[PDB]
Amino acid sequence: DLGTENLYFQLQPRRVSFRGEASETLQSPGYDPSRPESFFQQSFQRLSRLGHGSYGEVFKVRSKEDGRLYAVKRSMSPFRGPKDRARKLAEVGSHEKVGQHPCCVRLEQAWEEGGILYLQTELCGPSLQQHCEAWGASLPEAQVWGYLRDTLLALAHLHSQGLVHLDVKPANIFLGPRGRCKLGDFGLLVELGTAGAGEVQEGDPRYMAPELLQGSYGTAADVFSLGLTILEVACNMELPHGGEGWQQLRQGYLPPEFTAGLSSELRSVLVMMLEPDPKLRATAEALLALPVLRQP
Numbered sequence: 001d002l003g004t005e006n007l008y009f010q011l012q013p014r015r016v017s018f019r020g021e022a023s024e025t026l027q028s029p030g031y032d033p034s035r036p037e038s039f040f041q042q043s044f045q046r047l048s049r050l051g052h053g054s055y056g057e058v059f060k061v062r063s064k065e066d067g068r069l070y071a072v073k074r075s076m077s078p079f080r081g082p083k084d085r086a087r088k089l090a091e092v093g094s095h096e097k098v099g100q101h102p103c104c105v106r107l108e109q110a111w112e113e114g115g116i117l118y119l120q121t122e123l124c125g126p127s128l129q130q131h132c133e134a135w136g137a138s139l140p141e142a143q144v145w146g147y148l149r150d151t152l153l154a155l156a157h158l159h160s161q162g163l164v165h166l167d168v169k170p171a172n173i174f175l176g177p178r179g180r181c182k183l184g185d186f187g188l189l190v191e192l193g194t195a196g197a198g199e200v201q202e203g204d205p206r207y208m209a210p211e212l213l214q215g216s217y218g219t220a221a222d223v224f225s226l227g228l229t230i231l232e233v234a235c236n237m238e239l240p241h242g243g244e245g246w247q248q249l250r251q252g253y254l255p256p257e258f259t260a261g262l263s264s265e266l267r268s269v270l271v272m273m274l275e276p277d278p279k280l281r282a283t284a285e286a287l288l289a290l291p292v293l294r295q296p
């Protein structure tokens with residue numbers, strides 16, 4: 001409990017890494033620590049703002065180190081204090097607990113400076129959300145199957161290690177070349193059975209597994225969230241944040257006016273993923289064993 005520890009009320013960048021990686025000093029072509037500009041300002045070309053919110057901002061950048069494109073998430077304002085700092089840095093630890101996997105967004109490096117946290121990842125293609133916005137309609141099933149398979153591979157990787165993502169949604173699944181995708185955004189990720197029993201942040205209510213209302217955390221939660229993610233993109237169906245419709249989607253209801261055009265096979269898989277009872281809900285590994293989800 002950092003809130004009662006003597007850690008309160010206390011200029012150069014410091015690498016953030018939990019996996020262990022001395023040194024903690026940063027260097028780059030274009031960077032002179034005696035100049036007042038931040039490491040981020042000096043060491044990257046800032047090309048565009050990919051996203052923003054209460055957390056801060058995500059930029060498309062070009063690295064002066066290697067000339068390659070990356071995404072960098074920069075927190076909004078200096079750490080509020082020790083708990084805030086620990087919570088934000090925990091994202092780097094999580095992203096590292098996941099480690100390298102072809103269906104997970106890769107973290108290149110992370111650092112803090114002036115109370116600001118910076119996470120540099122590979123630059124991916126558009127999020128599934130962006131892609132569906134651009135399509136302006138339901139996605140063809142041939143695309144959907146590939147996205148379902150790849151995100152299930154990512155989840156099987158997390159879940160085998162007792163990690164739960166807790167915010168699977170169209171906005172943090174990113175398209176790559178020829179129909180592949182990657183899961184990102186490990187800021188809410190939890191390792192089951194690691195204190196505190198609480199401390200848990202809540203994902204987007206539209207995709208939240210019903211058992212989380214009772215505080216019942218487990219890997220099954222992500223399967224449900226991916227189920228609704230795929231339902232949304234396959235049907236161009238806006239998901240309720242609450243009310244009767246929110247309840248219905250968590251009672252096995254598939255709205256006919258949105259879902260009647262699904263193949264029987266995709267409908268059958270979604271029903272397995274959207275099972276209200278997490279004890280009965282299919283696991284990612286079990287789904288990937290189905291012949292319909294075999295390597296195409």
Ligand SMILES: COc1cc(Nc2c(C#N)cnc3cc(OCCCN4CCN(C)CC4)c(OC)cc23)c(Cl)cc1Cl
Nearest residue numbers: 050051071072073105119121122123124125126172184185
């Ligand atoms: C760096 O850190 C983090 C970054 C992210 N988010 C992203 C990651 C990752 N990771 C990777 N790659 C991304 C690529 C994106 O856009 C690509 C296409 C943009 N084009 C804009 C112009 N139009 C016309 C065409 C499409 C993007 O946009 C929102 C967000 C990305 C998250 Cl979710 C968490 C953390 Cl911690």
